[model samples]
Target: SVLSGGELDKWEKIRLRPGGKKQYKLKHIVWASRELERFAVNPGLLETSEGCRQILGQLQPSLQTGSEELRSLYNTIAVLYCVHQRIDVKDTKEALDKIEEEQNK
Candidate 1:
């Protein structure tokens, strides 16, 4: 039996219905950011700086300068950012229920 940890915990919360390309890229970000390497020394400043910028960029795609050939770069961050925030048991069906309750009023 596999014991779940941080990323694995997050993974199960996702049904995806089927999950992403933007999904995988940022998924890599989230998982990588928390890797054992990131700890036990622990955190790598350079790696974190680069990774952090990538994750943060997703929140502000237009702020990132790029060209048509670089659409994949921009796409990776944007979709990852959205999914990273969107899926989660903590903010899942409960939010849905609240919205429904509001609409009924």
Candidate 2:
């Protein structure tokens, strides 16, 4: 369990050092994500940045039409933005769209 510390266990971002240590950044990233997912609230809204330095930065760019790919990619960004509070629906859609387009191609 990530929340094995104290009453302050829930967190979105968890900092990790090469040596081996974790610093949890507990916050409302999940709430933010649900809001976005609920309505693409504003695909452009960045929990962090809004450009090249934007949230959900440069995703897989390309992929097959397999549910495996979609699930993997989806899970990643979902965690980053939803669980970790660090992305935007804009980039998320772009990433997924790339894969979807591959199917049509």
| Best-fitting candidate, scored by TM-score | 1
Per-model CA lDDT versus the true structure: 0.35, 0.36
Query: In model 2, which regions exceed 4 Å deviation?
Result: 1-55, 63-70, 86-105
Highest lDDT model number: 2
Task: Please give the TM-score that candidate 2 achieves against the real structure.
Answer: 0.23
Model 1, residue 90: what's the lDDT?
28
Model 1 stretches with alpha carbons more than 4 Å out: 1-65, 87-105
lDDT of 1 by residue, 2-102 (tens): 11244345534433223322223234444433542433222232133244234434324543564532343333332233333333332323323433354
Q: What would you estimate as the lDDT of candidate 2?
A: 0.36
**Cα TM-score per model:** 0.26, 0.23
